[PDB]
Design a protein. Structure first.
Ligand code: HEM
Ligand SMILES: [Mn+2]
Length: 291
């Protein structure tokens, strides 16, 4: 199974910058969402969940086909809490009907990271919507009640190594957990609508206590009111992950560089780009455009 990237007819960098802008402007418009967390974290989680269905062994799932638009995937229990993010992008798709679903969902994540003062993330167009019978079954996204061995083996399916895994998990600086979505409660950090290396700092510097929450799940809690999933906490239980957590806690610039690379890779898994395909785009933020 091969997915060849196909540029949307007659579309170039400037067309996609306008889609970026529409997303980024709507982020400002709806910045009150979830007591001023805004939609940024949800768009990042959405981009990851639509990419994270990939299986490298047979190239099923992945961002290419834009299959999240189909009810089987949209209603995956693992995707609870993303519906509002989907609905956020819906009017933007209607405004730019020419863009593919996969391109729009992935671009949403890129836009959100950059507008939350994160790293620039190069982005490529060319995902092509595929039919409903190409939708991956539920159950491909990872469980949070697991250990380091699980995290490591899980991410092998996405062709991610230790550094890529630890870098990607740093997106938990953003947003929060909600009992009604995932059975977990609380934020990882204080500044959770800004993309920083706070996740790693909090992992290392808070005192964590294992507690049962109101959903009967166990999570690691601090007296500052922060929490860590068991899979988060496994990054300091495992000696190889620990070393990398320390590196990113000490050097946000390095975290940013490694995250940019791993996130683009995540969003592009499964896609074959023709040799004459356009080079990756790096979009300007609203601020850089004086918008
Ligand atoms: C072992 C892999 C992972 C597990 C188990 C996991 C688990 C979770 C859970 C349980 C939540 C709370 C969801 C809710 O209740 O609404 C969450 C939120 C979130 N995750 Fe992850 N995650 C993983 C990997 C990643 C990666 C790799 C990224 C980023 C590239 C990411 C980005 C996010 C973001 C942005 C949110 C917050 C969304 C919001 O505030 O609504 N996660 N995750
Ligand atoms: Mn949320």
């Amino acid at each position: 199974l091969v997915h060849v990237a196909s540029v949307e007819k007659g579309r170039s960098y400037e067309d996609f910058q306008k889609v970026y802008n529409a997303i980024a402007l709507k982020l400002r418009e709806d910045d009150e969402y979830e007591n001023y967390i805004g939609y940024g974290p949800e768009l990042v989680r959405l981009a990851w969940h639509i990419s994270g269905t990939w299986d490298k062994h047979d190239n099923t799932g992945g961002s290419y086909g834009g299959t999240y638009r189909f009810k089987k995937e949209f209603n995956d229990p693992s995707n609870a809490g993303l519906q509002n993010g989907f609905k956020f992008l819906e009017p933007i798709h209607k405004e730019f009907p020419w863009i593919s679903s996969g391109d729009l969902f992935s671009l949403g994540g890129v836009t959100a990271v950059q507008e939350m003062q994160g790293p620039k993330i190069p982005w490529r167009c060319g995902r092509v919507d595929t039919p409903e019978d190409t939708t991956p079954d539920n159950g491909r996204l990872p469980d949070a009640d697991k250990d380091a061995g699980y995290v490591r083996t899980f991410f092998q399916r996405l062709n991610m190594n230790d550094r890529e895994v630890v870098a990607l998990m740093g997106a938990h600086a953003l947003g929060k957990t909600e009992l009604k979505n995932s059975g977990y409660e609380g934020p990882w950090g204080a500044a959770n609508n800004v993309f920083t290396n706070e996740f790693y700092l909090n992992l290392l510097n808070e005192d964590w206590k294992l507690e049962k929450n109101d959903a009967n799940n166990e999570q690691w809690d601090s007296k500052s009111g922060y929490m860590m999933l068991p899979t988060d906490y496994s990054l300091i239980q495992d000696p190889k992950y620990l070393s990398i957590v320390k590196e990113y806690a000490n050097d946000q610039d390095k975290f940013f560089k490694d995250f940019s690379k791993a996130f683009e890779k995540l969003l592009e898994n499964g896609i074959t780009f023709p040799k004459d395909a356009p080079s990756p785009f790096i979009f300007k933020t609203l601020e850089e455009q004086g918008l």
